[PDB]
Design a protein around this nucleic acid. Structure first.
Lengths: 105, 90, 50, 73, 246, 72
RNA sequence: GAUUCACGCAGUGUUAACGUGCAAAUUACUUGUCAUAUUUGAGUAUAGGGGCGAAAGACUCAUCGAACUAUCUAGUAGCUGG
RNA sequence: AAGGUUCCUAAACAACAUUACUUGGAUUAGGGUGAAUCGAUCCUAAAUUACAGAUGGAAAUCCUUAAGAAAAGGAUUGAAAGGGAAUAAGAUUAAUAGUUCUUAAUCAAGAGAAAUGGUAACAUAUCAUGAACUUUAAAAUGGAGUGUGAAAAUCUACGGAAGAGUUCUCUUUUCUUCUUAACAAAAGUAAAUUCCACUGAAAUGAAUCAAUCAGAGAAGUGGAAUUUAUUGGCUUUGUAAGAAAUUCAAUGAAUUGUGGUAUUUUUGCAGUCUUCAUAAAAAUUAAAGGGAAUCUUUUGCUCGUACUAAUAACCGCAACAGGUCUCCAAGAAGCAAAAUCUUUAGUUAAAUAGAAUAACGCAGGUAAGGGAAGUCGGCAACAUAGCUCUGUAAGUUAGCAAGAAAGAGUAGCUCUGGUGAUUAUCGAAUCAGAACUUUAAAGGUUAGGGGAAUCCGACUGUUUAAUAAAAACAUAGCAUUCUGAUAAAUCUAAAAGGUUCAUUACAGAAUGUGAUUUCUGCCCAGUGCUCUG
RNA sequence: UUUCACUCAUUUCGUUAAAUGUUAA
């Protein structure tokens, strides 16, 4: 077995100091700097992880294509599909009831 | 399994028979599921001291420290309803 | 340390520069008593305290 | 490094004016046409000699062409 | 001798409050016209756990009635509140659990909580777990109402002092017996530095007035005047009585 | 273990070099110099420290400009 | 905040070694303990009739029943030495 | 971190490393630290400090956004372990290398009436306009335990190619090499979870090691999305064999398959348990609601970078058996990262040796017969010791005591049987049993002495650094006193001053006793405290 | 001198000093 060493000057097993040992030419092993695990977006109301958006760092969303950082729908990145259907029904039904109850009952 | 020490057998033999009895009633009621007032399911479990969450219903309810609804918290709710109806009627 | 400030590093280099002996020609001057530098130090003998 | 999948892209690449250098590597079972562009190093794995000769006629004459074999240059 | 532990407590050293993870100040919203002469509606977005206190906190969200935006408030939960509930704050609000009403509109016998000792000071009385104050009577002659404090004392407040109708959540917290010293250690995670209390009789005469001699005892009466200086005021202060109560 | 053993962990400087007096008397946590009293506008001098007055005062340095003025 | 082993840590016993020592408190075996009242690095806060103390008058740079350093100060001595 | 030139080389050995030294971390003279991508620099945490204001006889103190004609909203500092735009492989030097060279990349800042598809979940090499203002999310969140996906290491199956070791006794034999980066691509193909469409479950079904779920809709069928150390997880591909490794010849030549229902480590995922504990903020980024308006190329500055990191480079007067935070981690055997032995790497010197083999010693041992008669006292030493099976008392808070106590078995060799997968072939260590043999089997190493009572402390924990580790302190439990916040306790010389208090009687402050069970008797004269007098 | 009534110094507070008081609709 080949034993390795930290390449950067950090020497503690911190969250940002994650490393991976991979094999290289001649049987030698090198050290990579691996990336932290991130979370996605959550529905603004029900707090459910949205589908169709990757779980990457906040700045990497800028590198992604314009279509890969959201979903083509009403509110489309902040509310689940269920979160929005409730919003549409609430808007239409309450306005309709506010139209019949008052406003020339 | 056990004759009488049901949930407080994890305390072994080191807190007193009386104290282990008192803590048993509270620990049973704290860990049990309650009927959830908005969807009528045995799906409410405690998440913190005074916060209860309906697992299969998506609601967070404020309640007692260990029971979903306290005896004093139920009489007060009944009392206010009587007061509100009396105020609303003359 | 491996990591040091710029000003601190220059004061480290000067302490290195001042740890030298009397040049031979200065020792041949007429009426010369300065043969050895009594302000000298070595890393394992005295710590410069900086 | 990027890979060119079929023949139409590399010819259009060769006729494109962004090229910088060409190096041809002859392996035991294939021939690779590594076009050194400004940004990437496009390559094309070829196994048919006649298509390779067609490719070799397609390189502009002004371009420095490097021929690589079992001995590296 | 030395300065006793009670003297060292007022200096703001290690005895400072461990309030770093706390949610914030829990209180009513600032009074305005829409609360004095109307009702504003709030939405209980979530119910959270504030470290160091026994009652849950509701993250209520109001709407700004004079500008565009939101008024994110932080109330103390009344028992029975749930996520998505609408709560109305104002002088014309309905008498329901969780609504914020001036103490003059509550009928005699109403159970309220988070009462303001002075109008507009955003909540003083009846804030612990399971606590509440009852309304005793009204007096429209001088616009004052009487309430009964959780300690049993009676207090007279202005009739426009606000309050939340109901019972503070988290009742029955202190009926569960702590069993271990470790559990009591975790109780003061978000509190001040007080827990392991050395008996004064186990101290030395320099440290504490009780610091005894060849037998662990006090020596002098432990009931002391109110006017004793800081340093010798240790034990029972202005004790009208002692011994077990009958 | 109050003697030899306790001195193993002494690897954290309390004082670093000062900027006004040049000595290793700048307390890091206190953010003041124990010798020349830095931040303080006035140089720190005490009448009980009569020797510390003669170690650093007027005439113990170069006197780059005053030597011309007084001779003038 | 169950029983034990290990990396570690402490210091119950030998009242062993050493006792002008490896060491101004350490070594060997034995013993105990070895993750939640746990162990630990850095930063930060608390300073002299003050701090800090699960409390031994313990700790506060080998100094603590009141630190270190300088001035008053060549303090006074019916006492001891010359 | 600390040290500061101790790093490399050459000349030289007066001094120093308890002899010596041609050696040296010692003398003399030179050489040596290369960054757009690693860090500092940027942000904020505990906290810290300014102008004006407030306080003070004074020095100075308080306040940190409240007091201000100051700062859309609040000033400075505070992390080389928290947050954070972007780099890798090979080679190179006497010494530097995510820093130089070759090759190959990435990032930021610049320059040259406004789209489709899908029923839906949602998808489209930039595309396909999107201002003020507002909201949401990310950065950004405890711990335990169980299951499992993938990679690496070790082990192993089939087929080999090259080299090496053993060989008068055998051994188709034993050993080594057979590799691949950042960044991207998309032949082939996974595990887990969440949603969408059709349909409507009872004779209730679906499923996990455990759970858990369903008419606010299960199971089934067909889809969509996200995660799995870069693109998209694994094999594979470009980079890329031209490198590197193993051989051969004298620069040039050869090879570089496919698997495993095995162990460990790492990294994710899914649910379960637990809290009177709920387990950071900002810089910075994106989306949304609203509808105001009408590929090539340039540049990337400042600072650190050598070396030790310790039985010789740090702190203890020193080359001091003391102390000092981390990363990577092979084989045997075993439950075990234990003890013992070995491979890669390191070293054979680390305050001097030679001869003789007296006493008395320090360290490790054994001993006839007796077995604590020694001694203050079984102090020291001896003795038990793993695993399997049988068996296990009084007492008890009914949980324990309990590994109680006590007894038997265990080796080697040759066999037999049980526990599965794929549809006959393949595979795992685990358990049970039977003949035979002997020096009769845990014991090389590691490895509990047991029982009957009495006293104290309930327990886990802490304690006099350097003669006291305990019955002492803490503890949970019990009890008492004061206080409605402009308060109680309490710091300050003063203060729009400070602490509990981001608090509000289920709270804050002050005390005694110390788990549980049973019980707390009489006394208000004396001294305290109090009175609604 | 005591008991009253007020606020105007004074105290304690709250906010983005965001509809206070009296008429009007």
């Amino acid at each position: 077995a080949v034993r390795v060493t930290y390449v950067r000057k950090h020497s503690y097993n911190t969250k940002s100091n994650g490393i991976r040992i991979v094999k290289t030419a001649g049987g030698n092993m090198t050290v990579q700097h691996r990336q932290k695990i991130s979370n996605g977006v959550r529905c603004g109301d029900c707090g459910c992880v949205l589908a169709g958006i990757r779980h990457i760092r906040p700045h990497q969303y800028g590198w992604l294509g314009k279509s890969k950082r959201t979903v083509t729908r009403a509110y489309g990145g902040v509310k689940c599909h269920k979160c929005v259907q409730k919003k549409i029904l609430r808007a239409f039904l309450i306005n309709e009831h506010n139209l019949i109850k008052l406003a020339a009952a | 399994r056990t004759k009488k020490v049901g949930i407080v057998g994890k305390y072994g033999t080191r807190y007193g028979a009386s104290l282990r009895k008192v803590i048993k009633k509270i620990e049973i009621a704290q860990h049990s599921k309650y009927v959830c007032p908005f969807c009528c399911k045995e799906a409410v479990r405690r998440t913190a001291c005074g916060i209860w969450e309906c697992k299969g219903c998506g609601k967070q309810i404020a309640g007692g420290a260990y029971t979903l609804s306290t005896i004093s918290g139920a009489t007060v709710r009944s009392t206010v309803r009587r007061l509100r109806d009396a105020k609303n009627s003359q | 340390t491996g990591h040091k400030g710029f000003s601190y590093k220059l004061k480290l280099g000067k302490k290195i520069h001042q740890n030298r002996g009397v040049p031979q020609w200065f020792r041949m001057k007429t009426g010369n008593t300065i043969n050895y530098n009594f302000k000298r130090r070595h890393w394992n003998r005295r710590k410069m305290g900086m | 490094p990027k890979q060119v999948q079929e023949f139409k892209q590399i010819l259009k690449l060769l006729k494109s004016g962004s090229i910088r250098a060409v190096r041809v590597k002859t392996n035991g079972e294939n021939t690779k046409f590594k076009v050194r562009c400004a940004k990437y190093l496009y390559t094309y794995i070829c196994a048919d000699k006649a298509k390779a000769e067609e490719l070799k006629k397609a390189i502009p004459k002004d371009i420095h062409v490097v021929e690589i074999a079992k001995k590296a240059p | 001798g030395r300065r006793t532990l009670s003297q060292r407590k007022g200096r703001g050293s290690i005895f400072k409050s461990r309030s770093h993870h706390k949610l914030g100040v829990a209180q009513h919203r600032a009074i305005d016209f829409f609360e004095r002469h109307s009702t504003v509606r709030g939405l209980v977005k979530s119910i959270e756990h504030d470290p160091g206190r026994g009652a849950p906190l509701a993250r209520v969200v109001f709407r700004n009635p004079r500008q565009y935006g939101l008024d994110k408030e932080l109330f103390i939960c009344a028992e029975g509140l749930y996520s998505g509930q609408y709560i109305y704050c104002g002088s014309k609000a309905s008498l329901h659990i969780g609504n914020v009403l001036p103490i003059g509109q509550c009928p005699e016998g109403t159970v309220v909580c988070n009462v303001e000792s002075k109008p507009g000071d955003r909540g003083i009385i009846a804030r612990a777990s399971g606590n509440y104050a009852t309304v005793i009577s009204h007096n429209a002659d001088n616009e004052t109402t009487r309430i009964r404090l959780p300690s049993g004392a009676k207090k007279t407040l202005k009739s426009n002092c606000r309050a939340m109708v109901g019972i503070i959540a988290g009742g029955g917290r202190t009926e569960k017996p702590i069993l271990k010293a470790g559990v009591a250690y975790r109780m003061y995670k978000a509190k001040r530095t007080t827990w392991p209390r050395v008996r004064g009789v186990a101290m030395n005469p320099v440290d504490h007035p009780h610091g005894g001699g060849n037998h662990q005892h006090v020596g002098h009466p432990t009931t002391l005047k109110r006017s004793s200086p800081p340093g010798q005021k240790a034990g029972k202060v202005a004790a009208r009585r002692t011994g077990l109560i009958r | 273990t109050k003697g030899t053993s306790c001195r193993g962990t002494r690897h954290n400087k309390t004082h670093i070099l000062c900027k006004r007096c040049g000595k290793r008397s700048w307390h890091l946590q206190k953010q003041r110099c124990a010798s020349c009293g830095y931040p303080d506008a006035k140089m720190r001098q005490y009448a009980w420290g009569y020797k510390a007055l003669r170690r650093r005062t007027q005439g113990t340095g170069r006197m780059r400009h005053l030597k011309i003025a007084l001779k003038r």
